[PDB]
Amino acid sequence: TYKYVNKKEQESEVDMKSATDNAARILMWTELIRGLGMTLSYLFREPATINYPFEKGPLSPRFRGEHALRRYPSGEERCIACKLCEAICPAQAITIEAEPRADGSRRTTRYDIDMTKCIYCGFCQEACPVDAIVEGPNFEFSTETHEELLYNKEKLLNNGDKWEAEIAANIQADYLYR
Template sequence: MAEEKKSAGLGKALGELLAPVAGFGVTFSNMFRPTVTEQYPFVKHPTAPRYHGRHQLNRYPDGLEKCIGCELCAWACPADAIFVEGGDNTPDNQLSPGERNGRVYQINYLRCIFCGLCIEACPTRALTMTNEFELAGPTREGLIFTKEDLLAPLKEGMLAAPHPMVEGTTDGDYYRGEVTGPTQSQVDWVEENRPEDPTLAAAGKAAREAAK
């Protein structure tokens, strides 16, 4: 028994003596590895597919905005970084399906913690997060992104809003993904009210192809 105690005491003393050396093991193992320097911003590595970067306000295939101004994203934000002010859609100013639209939309990136809770709260999938992470700027005001900064660009064949909803549809049809692009009726409305709209040509072509 005495020998076992003596052996245990010796082992404990030896462990305490070598503990600092073991702690430096990580340091010593890395001292002889080659240095890896990332040449940012000249060489940029791709982010993960689900990376939480800058937000984006999305559109439906016909060009109407998905945001309905419900403010649920603002309520869900733990950092109070989002400000939304809803507006009413009218026959002459139909920005989104249904009765309401996001008239004012702002995200303060000085406060945003990129948690993604706003994305989970959005009922229409209007708000998503991109892989863009370069958000630094010279002024505080420039880091408050407005609706114009956050709106997704119009894809080929989309018709710039405002314009009427697809004839014979409800907002539920939009939410279920049953609207796949602009129709000739929508193109005619924009042509009558905004004949200089640059999206008319591509949207008209898409509407004619869809009607075949």
């Protein structure tokens, strides 16, 4: 179906009352007074402004911000160098080099992420079959230097050791929806 927005106008019938009403509208600026009234109403409303950085904007567990490599509760690393994360990373931001750890386990030596290439898409944490790489909630990690934004294994491991209390709970919340 369809409707008209500016064809409503029908044949012209005009009286003295209609003419006088249009004249008052044209001479006393009726329609503009109404915009003035709207802006006035907004002045006496509560502003939606939050007091950052004290009170902050809402978020959800699914928020995908800063990356971190997690561990099993034993302290062992979850990554096994399967390389799905870098195989799908559509920005080619991940870089991995694996090697048999002295104990024989399959682990990484290099795990680098150019956070100037990451598009923060989440494909790596939905590809990881061991829930090792995640995209944490932290977004307040700006820097004064480009180099600081080229994370390696130690940086991501430290982030994981810093946010686990939050990452784990957000996972526990969201992992049934996946």
